[PDB]
Amino acid sequence: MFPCLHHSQNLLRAVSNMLQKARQTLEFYPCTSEEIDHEDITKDKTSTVEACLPLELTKNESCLNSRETSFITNGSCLASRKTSFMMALCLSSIYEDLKMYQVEFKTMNAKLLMDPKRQIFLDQNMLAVIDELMQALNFNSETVPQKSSLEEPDFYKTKIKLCILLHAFRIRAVTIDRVMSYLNA
Protein backbone atom coordinates (compact mmCIF):
# COMPACT_ATOMS: atom_id res chain seq x y z
CA MET A 1 0.00 0.00 0.00
CA PHE A 2 1.36 3.48 -0.94
CA PRO A 3 -0.07 6.47 1.05
CA CYS A 4 0.36 8.90 -1.92
CA LEU A 5 -1.31 6.25 -4.17
CA HIS A 6 -4.24 6.21 -1.68
CA HIS A 7 -4.42 10.06 -1.91
CA SER A 8 -4.27 9.87 -5.75
CA GLN A 9 -7.02 7.17 -5.82
CA ASN A 10 -9.05 9.48 -3.50
CA LEU A 11 -8.37 12.38 -5.94
CA LEU A 12 -9.62 10.47 -9.03
CA ARG A 13 -12.78 9.33 -7.15
CA ALA A 14 -13.45 12.90 -5.85
CA VAL A 15 -13.14 14.37 -9.40
CA SER A 16 -15.44 11.61 -10.78
CA ASN A 17 -18.18 12.53 -8.23
CA MET A 18 -17.76 16.31 -8.81
CA LEU A 19 -17.89 15.81 -12.63
CA GLN A 20 -21.19 13.85 -12.27
CA LYS A 21 -22.64 16.65 -10.07
CA ALA A 22 -21.52 19.30 -12.62
CA ARG A 23 -23.33 17.53 -15.51
CA GLN A 24 -26.57 17.20 -13.44
CA THR A 25 -26.51 20.82 -12.13
CA LEU A 26 -25.70 22.55 -15.49
CA GLU A 27 -28.45 20.94 -17.67
CA PHE A 28 -28.30 23.59 -20.48
CA TYR A 29 -24.57 24.54 -20.25
CA PRO A 30 -22.90 21.83 -22.48
CA CYS A 31 -20.77 19.59 -20.19
CA THR A 32 -20.64 16.21 -22.02
CA SER A 33 -17.15 14.91 -23.00
CA GLU A 34 -18.16 15.09 -26.69
CA GLU A 35 -19.15 18.80 -26.66
CA ILE A 36 -16.26 20.02 -24.40
CA ASP A 37 -12.87 20.60 -26.12
CA HIS A 38 -9.74 19.31 -24.33
CA GLU A 39 -7.73 22.33 -23.13
CA ASP A 40 -4.83 21.87 -20.65
CA ILE A 41 -3.67 24.97 -18.69
CA THR A 42 -0.36 23.21 -17.82
CA LYS A 43 0.47 22.57 -21.52
CA ASP A 44 3.96 24.11 -21.60
CA LYS A 45 4.67 25.05 -17.97
CA THR A 46 5.25 21.48 -16.68
CA SER A 47 6.90 18.31 -18.05
CA THR A 48 4.50 15.71 -16.49
CA VAL A 49 3.47 14.63 -20.04
CA GLU A 50 7.09 13.52 -20.74
CA ALA A 51 8.83 12.98 -17.34
CA CYS A 52 6.05 10.82 -15.79
CA LEU A 53 6.58 7.54 -17.72
CA PRO A 54 7.53 3.94 -16.69
CA LEU A 55 11.36 3.53 -16.68
CA GLU A 56 11.08 0.91 -19.49
CA LEU A 57 9.13 3.35 -21.75
CA THR A 58 11.64 6.27 -21.47
CA LYS A 59 15.12 5.50 -22.92
CA ASN A 60 16.63 8.08 -25.36
CA GLU A 61 16.25 10.81 -22.66
CA SER A 62 16.71 13.26 -25.57
CA CYS A 63 12.97 14.18 -25.37
CA LEU A 64 13.34 15.34 -21.74
CA ASN A 65 14.06 18.93 -22.92
CA SER A 66 17.22 20.22 -21.15
CA ARG A 67 15.90 19.06 -17.72
CA GLU A 68 12.86 21.38 -18.19
CA THR A 69 11.67 22.87 -14.84
CA SER A 70 14.09 20.44 -13.10
CA PHE A 71 13.39 21.84 -9.57
CA ILE A 72 13.47 18.27 -8.10
CA THR A 73 11.71 19.39 -4.87
CA ASN A 74 12.36 16.84 -2.06
CA GLY A 75 9.22 15.43 -0.40
CA SER A 76 7.59 12.89 1.96
CA CYS A 77 6.01 10.88 -0.91
CA LEU A 78 9.35 9.34 -1.96
CA ALA A 79 12.68 9.17 -0.07
CA SER A 80 15.67 11.32 -1.19
CA ARG A 81 17.93 8.29 -1.98
CA LYS A 82 15.09 5.92 -3.02
CA THR A 83 14.21 6.47 -6.73
CA SER A 84 15.78 7.57 -10.07
CA PHE A 85 15.73 11.21 -11.27
CA MET A 86 13.08 10.25 -13.86
CA MET A 87 10.55 9.81 -11.00
CA ALA A 88 11.98 12.73 -8.92
CA LEU A 89 11.33 15.21 -11.79
CA CYS A 90 7.87 13.60 -12.29
CA LEU A 91 6.85 14.09 -8.61
CA SER A 92 7.92 17.78 -8.74
CA SER A 93 5.96 18.33 -12.01
CA ILE A 94 2.85 16.62 -10.49
CA TYR A 95 3.13 18.98 -7.46
CA GLU A 96 3.29 21.95 -9.89
CA ASP A 97 0.23 20.64 -11.84
CA LEU A 98 -1.81 20.47 -8.59
CA LYS A 99 -0.66 24.01 -7.61
CA MET A 100 -1.74 25.47 -11.01
CA TYR A 101 -5.19 23.77 -10.76
CA GLN A 102 -5.87 24.57 -7.05
CA VAL A 103 -5.11 28.32 -7.56
CA GLU A 104 -7.56 28.38 -10.52
CA PHE A 105 -10.28 26.25 -8.80
CA LYS A 106 -10.29 28.59 -5.74
CA THR A 107 -10.68 31.63 -8.07
CA MET A 108 -13.71 29.97 -9.78
CA ASN A 109 -15.30 28.97 -6.42
CA ALA A 110 -15.02 32.56 -5.07
CA LYS A 111 -16.87 33.87 -8.18
CA LEU A 112 -19.51 31.03 -7.98
CA LEU A 113 -20.51 31.88 -4.35
CA MET A 114 -21.72 35.40 -5.39
CA ASP A 115 -24.54 33.79 -7.49
CA PRO A 116 -28.00 34.75 -6.04
CA LYS A 117 -28.92 31.00 -6.19
CA ARG A 118 -26.53 28.07 -5.50
CA GLN A 119 -26.74 26.13 -8.82
CA ILE A 120 -23.14 24.76 -8.48
CA PHE A 121 -20.01 25.28 -6.29
CA LEU A 122 -16.66 23.39 -6.26
CA ASP A 123 -16.49 20.44 -3.78
CA GLN A 124 -14.60 21.49 -0.60
CA ASN A 125 -13.55 17.82 -0.10
CA MET A 126 -11.95 17.67 -3.60
CA LEU A 127 -9.94 20.88 -2.90
CA ALA A 128 -8.81 19.46 0.49
CA VAL A 129 -7.57 16.22 -1.19
CA ILE A 130 -5.51 18.29 -3.70
CA ASP A 131 -3.86 20.20 -0.80
CA GLU A 132 -3.16 16.98 1.21
CA LEU A 133 -1.46 15.33 -1.82
CA MET A 134 0.68 18.48 -2.45
CA GLN A 135 1.83 18.52 1.22
CA ALA A 136 3.17 14.94 0.81
CA LEU A 137 4.65 15.71 -2.68
CA ASN A 138 6.71 18.77 -1.54
CA PHE A 139 7.68 19.92 2.00
CA ASN A 140 7.65 23.60 0.93
CA SER A 141 3.88 23.49 0.19
CA GLU A 142 2.30 26.92 -0.30
CA THR A 143 -1.35 27.19 0.90
CA VAL A 144 -3.35 29.43 -1.53
CA PRO A 145 -4.73 32.58 0.27
CA GLN A 146 -8.55 33.01 0.52
CA LYS A 147 -9.53 34.65 -2.81
CA SER A 148 -12.42 37.15 -3.18
CA SER A 149 -13.67 39.87 -5.60
CA LEU A 150 -15.27 43.29 -4.89
CA GLU A 151 -17.50 43.00 -8.03
CA GLU A 152 -19.78 40.36 -9.66
CA PRO A 153 -18.47 38.46 -12.77
CA ASP A 154 -20.58 37.05 -15.65
CA PHE A 155 -21.64 33.56 -14.44
CA TYR A 156 -22.13 31.86 -17.85
CA LYS A 157 -18.41 32.27 -18.73
CA THR A 158 -17.31 30.82 -15.33
CA LYS A 159 -19.67 27.81 -15.77
CA ILE A 160 -18.33 27.02 -19.31
CA LYS A 161 -14.68 27.39 -18.11
CA LEU A 162 -15.48 25.18 -15.07
CA CYS A 163 -16.69 22.28 -17.27
CA ILE A 164 -13.58 22.60 -19.52
CA LEU A 165 -11.24 22.43 -16.46
CA LEU A 166 -13.05 19.55 -14.67
CA HIS A 167 -12.76 17.16 -17.69
CA ALA A 168 -9.06 18.06 -18.28
CA PHE A 169 -8.31 17.68 -14.53
CA ARG A 170 -9.93 14.19 -14.50
CA ILE A 171 -7.48 13.02 -17.24
CA ARG A 172 -4.60 14.50 -15.15
CA ALA A 173 -5.91 12.64 -12.04
CA VAL A 174 -5.73 9.23 -13.84
CA THR A 175 -2.14 10.08 -14.99
CA ILE A 176 -1.12 10.79 -11.34
CA ASP A 177 -2.84 7.52 -10.24
CA ARG A 178 -0.89 5.44 -12.85
CA VAL A 179 2.45 6.93 -11.63
CA MET A 180 1.56 6.25 -7.95
CA SER A 181 0.67 2.61 -8.81
CA TYR A 182 4.05 2.24 -10.62
CA LEU A 183 5.91 3.67 -7.56
CA ASN A 184 4.10 1.19 -5.24
CA ALA A 185 4.94 -1.76 -7.55
Binding site: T48, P54, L57, N60, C63, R178, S181, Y182
Partner: protein
Amino acid sequence: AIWELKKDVYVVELDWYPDAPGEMVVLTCDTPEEDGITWTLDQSSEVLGSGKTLTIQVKEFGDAGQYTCHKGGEVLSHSLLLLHKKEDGIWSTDILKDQKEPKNKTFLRCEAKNYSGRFTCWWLTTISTDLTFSVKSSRGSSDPQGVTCGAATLSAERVRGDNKEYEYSVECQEDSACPAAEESLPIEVMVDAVHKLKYENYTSSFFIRDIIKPDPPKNLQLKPLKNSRQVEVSWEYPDTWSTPHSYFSLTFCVQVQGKEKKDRVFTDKTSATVICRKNASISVRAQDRYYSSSWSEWASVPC
Protein backbone atom coordinates in the same frame (compact mmCIF):
# COMPACT_ATOMS: atom_id res chain seq x y z
CA ALA B 1 -13.80 24.10 -58.35
CA ILE B 2 -11.11 21.89 -60.01
CA TRP B 3 -8.25 20.43 -57.88
CA GLU B 4 -5.78 17.54 -58.44
CA LEU B 5 -6.19 14.51 -56.12
CA LYS B 6 -2.92 13.13 -57.63
CA LYS B 7 -0.84 13.71 -60.81
CA ASP B 8 -3.02 13.16 -63.96
CA VAL B 9 -6.18 12.97 -61.73
CA TYR B 10 -8.42 16.08 -61.32
CA VAL B 11 -11.52 16.03 -59.03
CA VAL B 12 -14.26 18.50 -60.20
CA GLU B 13 -16.88 19.77 -57.68
CA LEU B 14 -20.39 20.09 -59.23
CA ASP B 15 -23.77 21.20 -57.74
CA TRP B 16 -26.51 18.52 -58.08
CA TYR B 17 -29.91 20.01 -59.11
CA PRO B 18 -31.97 19.46 -62.35
CA ASP B 19 -30.91 21.31 -65.57
CA ALA B 20 -27.66 22.55 -63.91
CA PRO B 21 -25.03 24.49 -66.04
CA GLY B 22 -21.50 22.99 -65.78
CA GLU B 23 -18.26 24.68 -64.57
CA MET B 24 -15.99 25.79 -67.48
CA VAL B 25 -13.22 23.11 -67.36
CA VAL B 26 -9.83 23.66 -69.12
CA LEU B 27 -7.50 20.71 -70.03
CA THR B 28 -3.72 21.39 -70.38
CA CYS B 29 -0.86 19.00 -71.36
CA ASP B 30 2.69 19.27 -69.87
CA THR B 31 4.49 17.93 -73.00
CA PRO B 32 6.90 19.38 -75.66
CA GLU B 33 4.66 21.66 -77.80
CA GLU B 34 3.05 19.75 -80.73
CA ASP B 35 0.98 21.42 -83.51
CA GLY B 36 -2.20 19.31 -83.91
CA ILE B 37 -2.67 17.45 -80.58
CA THR B 38 -5.98 15.48 -80.76
CA TRP B 39 -8.12 14.54 -77.71
CA THR B 40 -10.28 11.44 -77.01
CA LEU B 41 -12.57 10.61 -74.02
CA ASP B 42 -13.88 7.10 -74.92
CA GLN B 43 -11.61 4.25 -76.18
CA SER B 44 -13.30 4.84 -79.59
CA SER B 45 -11.35 6.97 -82.10
CA GLU B 46 -14.06 9.63 -81.98
CA VAL B 47 -11.89 12.79 -81.66
CA LEU B 48 -13.25 15.39 -79.19
CA GLY B 49 -10.95 18.41 -79.72
CA SER B 50 -7.72 19.63 -81.40
CA GLY B 51 -4.84 21.73 -79.95
CA LYS B 52 -2.78 21.40 -76.72
CA THR B 53 -5.85 22.76 -74.83
CA LEU B 54 -9.35 21.15 -74.62
CA THR B 55 -12.41 22.97 -73.14
CA ILE B 56 -15.40 20.83 -71.96
CA GLN B 57 -17.88 21.65 -69.14
CA VAL B 58 -18.57 18.46 -67.08
CA LYS B 59 -22.36 18.89 -66.99
CA GLU B 60 -22.88 15.17 -66.33
CA PHE B 61 -20.99 11.98 -65.36
CA GLY B 62 -20.77 10.96 -69.06
CA ASP B 63 -18.51 14.01 -69.61
CA ALA B 64 -16.03 12.79 -66.91
CA GLY B 65 -13.52 10.02 -67.79
CA GLN B 66 -9.97 9.46 -69.00
CA TYR B 67 -9.42 12.23 -71.58
CA THR B 68 -6.34 11.11 -73.57
CA CYS B 69 -3.57 13.49 -74.74
CA HIS B 70 -2.31 11.90 -77.99
CA LYS B 71 -0.40 13.38 -80.98
CA GLY B 72 1.79 11.83 -83.72
CA GLY B 73 0.08 8.52 -83.01
CA GLU B 74 1.70 8.41 -79.53
CA VAL B 75 -0.26 9.22 -76.35
CA LEU B 76 1.61 12.28 -75.04
CA SER B 77 -0.21 12.48 -71.65
CA HIS B 78 -3.35 11.33 -69.74
CA SER B 79 -6.18 13.37 -68.09
CA LEU B 80 -8.42 11.20 -65.82
CA LEU B 81 -11.44 13.16 -64.43
CA LEU B 82 -13.10 12.49 -61.01
CA LEU B 83 -16.44 14.03 -59.85
CA HIS B 84 -17.37 15.22 -56.31
CA LYS B 85 -21.19 15.65 -56.37
CA LYS B 86 -22.58 18.34 -54.00
CA GLU B 87 -26.34 18.12 -53.25
CA ASP B 88 -28.08 21.22 -51.75
CA GLY B 89 -24.55 22.50 -50.89
CA ILE B 90 -23.83 19.24 -48.98
CA TRP B 91 -21.03 16.84 -50.10
CA SER B 92 -22.46 13.47 -51.32
CA THR B 93 -21.83 10.34 -49.19
CA ASP B 94 -22.79 7.30 -51.33
CA ILE B 95 -19.79 4.91 -51.42
CA LEU B 96 -19.74 4.03 -47.65
CA LYS B 97 -22.77 3.26 -45.45
CA ASP B 98 -23.89 4.92 -42.19
CA GLN B 99 -23.44 2.34 -39.38
CA LYS B 100 -25.02 4.89 -36.92
CA GLU B 101 -23.95 2.88 -33.81
CA PRO B 102 -22.15 5.85 -32.04
CA LYS B 103 -24.45 8.54 -33.61
CA ASN B 104 -25.81 9.65 -37.05
CA LYS B 105 -23.38 10.39 -39.95
CA THR B 106 -20.78 7.84 -38.68
CA PHE B 107 -19.10 5.97 -41.60
CA LEU B 108 -15.70 5.23 -39.96
CA ARG B 109 -15.32 3.10 -36.77
CA CYS B 110 -11.77 2.79 -35.34
CA GLU B 111 -10.44 0.60 -32.43
CA ALA B 112 -7.15 -0.27 -30.64
CA LYS B 113 -5.99 -3.02 -28.20
CA ASN B 114 -2.79 -1.38 -26.83
CA TYR B 115 -1.36 2.01 -25.68
CA SER B 116 1.45 1.47 -28.28
CA GLY B 117 -0.64 3.51 -30.78
CA ARG B 118 -1.40 0.63 -33.17
CA PHE B 119 -5.06 1.00 -34.30
CA THR B 120 -7.37 -0.39 -37.06
CA CYS B 121 -10.36 1.39 -38.72
CA TRP B 122 -13.32 -0.53 -40.28
CA TRP B 123 -15.65 1.00 -42.93
CA LEU B 124 -18.67 -0.89 -44.41
CA THR B 125 -19.40 -0.26 -48.13
CA THR B 126 -22.02 -1.98 -50.31
CA ILE B 127 -20.33 -1.32 -53.73
CA SER B 128 -19.04 -4.72 -54.99
CA THR B 129 -16.46 -3.69 -57.66
CA ASP B 130 -14.56 -0.66 -59.06
CA LEU B 131 -13.82 0.56 -55.49
CA THR B 132 -10.49 2.08 -54.27
CA PHE B 133 -9.67 3.78 -50.92
CA SER B 134 -6.83 6.25 -50.07
CA VAL B 135 -6.01 6.43 -46.30
CA LYS B 136 -3.92 9.21 -44.61
CA SER B 137 -3.51 9.95 -40.84
CA SER B 138 -1.77 12.48 -38.50
CA ARG B 139 -1.76 13.50 -34.78
CA GLY B 140 -3.49 16.87 -34.88
CA SER B 141 -1.87 18.64 -37.86
CA SER B 142 1.53 19.47 -36.31
CA ASP B 143 3.14 16.01 -36.80
CA PRO B 144 4.39 15.61 -40.42
CA GLN B 145 4.51 11.86 -41.19
CA GLY B 146 3.07 11.38 -37.66
CA VAL B 147 1.13 8.17 -38.51
CA THR B 148 2.05 5.45 -41.07
CA CYS B 149 -1.31 4.16 -42.32
CA GLY B 150 -1.21 0.85 -44.24
CA ALA B 151 -3.34 -0.12 -47.22
CA ALA B 152 -7.09 -0.91 -47.29
CA THR B 153 -7.92 -4.65 -47.51
CA LEU B 154 -11.35 -6.33 -47.90
CA SER B 155 -11.99 -8.12 -44.59
CA ALA B 156 -15.46 -9.76 -44.60
CA GLU B 157 -18.43 -10.37 -46.95
CA ARG B 158 -21.47 -10.68 -44.64
CA VAL B 159 -25.08 -10.88 -45.99
CA ARG B 160 -27.00 -8.14 -44.14
CA GLY B 161 -30.44 -8.21 -45.80
CA ASP B 162 -29.53 -9.17 -49.40
CA ASN B 163 -27.05 -6.29 -49.98
CA LYS B 164 -23.99 -8.28 -48.80
CA GLU B 165 -22.08 -5.37 -47.18
CA TYR B 166 -18.27 -5.77 -47.57
CA GLU B 167 -16.03 -4.48 -44.69
CA TYR B 168 -12.67 -2.81 -45.60
CA SER B 169 -10.08 -1.97 -42.87
CA VAL B 170 -6.66 -0.21 -42.59
CA GLU B 171 -3.77 -0.84 -40.13
CA CYS B 172 -2.20 2.40 -38.79
CA GLN B 173 0.66 2.74 -36.23
CA GLU B 174 1.62 6.02 -34.47
CA ASP B 175 5.22 6.45 -35.76
CA SER B 176 6.14 9.02 -33.05
CA ALA B 177 9.40 7.86 -31.40
CA CYS B 178 8.97 9.98 -28.23
CA PRO B 179 6.80 8.24 -25.58
CA ALA B 180 4.26 10.54 -23.86
CA ALA B 181 2.03 9.90 -20.82
CA GLU B 182 -1.11 11.74 -22.02
CA GLU B 183 -2.47 12.69 -25.47
CA SER B 184 -3.42 16.37 -26.12
CA LEU B 185 -4.29 16.05 -29.87
CA PRO B 186 -6.90 13.65 -31.41
CA ILE B 187 -5.62 11.34 -34.23
CA GLU B 188 -7.37 12.23 -37.55
CA VAL B 189 -7.99 9.59 -40.30
CA MET B 190 -9.15 10.54 -43.85
CA VAL B 191 -10.43 7.91 -46.37
CA ASP B 192 -10.56 9.20 -49.99
CA ALA B 193 -13.11 6.73 -51.35
CA VAL B 194 -13.02 6.51 -55.16
CA HIS B 195 -15.56 4.60 -57.34
CA LYS B 196 -15.36 4.83 -61.17
CA LEU B 197 -15.72 8.59 -61.93
CA LYS B 198 -17.11 9.49 -58.42
CA TYR B 199 -14.87 10.79 -55.55
CA GLU B 200 -15.89 11.04 -51.83
CA ASN B 201 -13.83 11.79 -48.65
CA TYR B 202 -14.55 10.91 -44.96
CA THR B 203 -12.76 12.34 -41.86
CA SER B 204 -12.76 10.78 -38.32
CA SER B 205 -11.10 12.29 -35.17
CA PHE B 206 -10.56 10.18 -31.99
CA PHE B 207 -8.25 9.39 -29.00
CA ILE B 208 -6.47 5.99 -28.58
CA ARG B 209 -7.77 5.55 -24.98
CA ASP B 210 -11.42 6.11 -26.08
CA ILE B 211 -11.24 3.56 -28.97
CA ILE B 212 -9.22 0.96 -26.96
CA LYS B 213 -10.95 -2.48 -26.76
CA PRO B 214 -9.06 -5.12 -24.63
CA ASP B 215 -8.56 -8.71 -25.92
CA PRO B 216 -10.19 -11.53 -23.79
CA PRO B 217 -8.53 -12.54 -20.43
CA LYS B 218 -5.83 -15.23 -20.87
CA ASN B 219 -5.29 -18.63 -19.09
CA LEU B 220 -8.68 -18.72 -17.31
CA GLN B 221 -8.75 -21.86 -15.07
CA LEU B 222 -11.12 -23.03 -12.27
CA LYS B 223 -9.57 -24.54 -9.08
CA PRO B 224 -12.15 -25.96 -6.55
CA LEU B 225 -11.38 -25.09 -2.88
CA LYS B 226 -10.93 -28.30 -0.81
CA ASN B 227 -14.14 -29.40 0.96
CA SER B 228 -16.11 -26.22 0.13
CA ARG B 229 -19.04 -25.47 -2.24
CA GLN B 230 -17.33 -22.34 -3.77
CA VAL B 231 -14.70 -22.63 -6.60
CA GLU B 232 -11.69 -20.25 -6.91
CA VAL B 233 -11.15 -19.05 -10.54
CA SER B 234 -7.77 -17.52 -11.61
CA TRP B 235 -7.08 -15.52 -14.83
CA GLU B 236 -3.99 -13.68 -16.26
CA TYR B 237 -3.36 -10.36 -18.12
CA PRO B 238 -3.28 -10.56 -22.01
CA ASP B 239 0.29 -10.56 -23.49
CA THR B 240 -0.82 -8.17 -26.32
CA TRP B 241 -1.89 -5.52 -23.74
CA SER B 242 0.77 -2.79 -23.13
CA THR B 243 3.43 -3.33 -20.40
CA PRO B 244 4.20 -2.71 -17.59
CA HIS B 245 0.88 -4.06 -16.22
CA SER B 246 1.20 -1.73 -13.19
CA TYR B 247 1.00 1.64 -15.06
CA PHE B 248 -1.72 0.34 -17.44
CA SER B 249 -4.41 -1.60 -15.51
CA LEU B 250 -7.62 -3.54 -16.38
CA THR B 251 -10.86 -4.33 -14.46
CA PHE B 252 -12.34 -7.86 -14.74
CA CYS B 253 -16.13 -8.39 -14.63
CA VAL B 254 -17.12 -12.06 -13.93
CA GLN B 255 -20.67 -13.23 -14.89
CA VAL B 256 -21.67 -16.80 -13.80
CA GLN B 257 -25.16 -16.77 -15.42
CA GLY B 258 -24.06 -19.18 -18.21
CA LYS B 259 -27.25 -21.21 -18.89
CA GLU B 260 -29.48 -15.37 -11.43
CA LYS B 261 -30.09 -13.00 -14.39
CA LYS B 262 -26.99 -10.97 -13.37
CA ASP B 263 -24.13 -12.81 -11.58
CA ARG B 264 -21.68 -10.11 -12.80
CA VAL B 265 -19.03 -9.22 -10.14
CA PHE B 266 -16.35 -6.54 -10.80
CA THR B 267 -12.97 -7.66 -9.36
CA ASP B 268 -9.62 -5.82 -9.79
CA LYS B 269 -7.94 -9.00 -8.38
CA THR B 270 -6.80 -11.69 -10.89
CA SER B 271 -8.58 -14.45 -8.88
CA ALA B 272 -12.22 -14.48 -7.66
CA THR B 273 -14.28 -17.25 -5.95
CA VAL B 274 -17.81 -18.03 -7.22
CA ILE B 275 -20.27 -20.83 -6.30
CA CYS B 276 -20.53 -23.02 -9.41
CA ARG B 277 -23.93 -24.47 -10.37
CA LYS B 278 -23.21 -27.70 -12.33
CA ASN B 279 -25.47 -26.51 -15.19
CA ALA B 280 -23.73 -23.16 -16.00
CA SER B 281 -20.58 -21.56 -17.53
CA ILE B 282 -18.37 -18.90 -15.83
CA SER B 283 -17.32 -16.01 -18.13
CA VAL B 284 -14.85 -13.07 -17.62
CA ARG B 285 -14.57 -9.65 -19.40
CA ALA B 286 -11.77 -7.01 -19.42
CA GLN B 287 -12.11 -3.16 -19.54
CA ASP B 288 -9.57 -0.35 -18.96
CA ARG B 289 -9.72 0.24 -15.16
CA TYR B 290 -8.72 3.94 -15.41
CA TYR B 291 -11.13 5.21 -18.14
CA SER B 292 -14.42 3.92 -19.66
CA SER B 293 -13.49 1.63 -22.62
CA SER B 294 -15.33 -0.86 -24.91
CA TRP B 295 -15.80 -4.17 -23.00
CA SER B 296 -13.67 -7.19 -24.12
CA GLU B 297 -15.13 -10.42 -25.61
CA TRP B 298 -16.38 -12.85 -22.88
CA ALA B 299 -13.90 -15.65 -21.99
CA SER B 300 -15.90 -18.77 -21.00
CA VAL B 301 -14.62 -21.95 -19.26
CA PRO B 302 -17.13 -24.86 -18.77
CA CYS B 303 -18.12 -25.49 -15.10
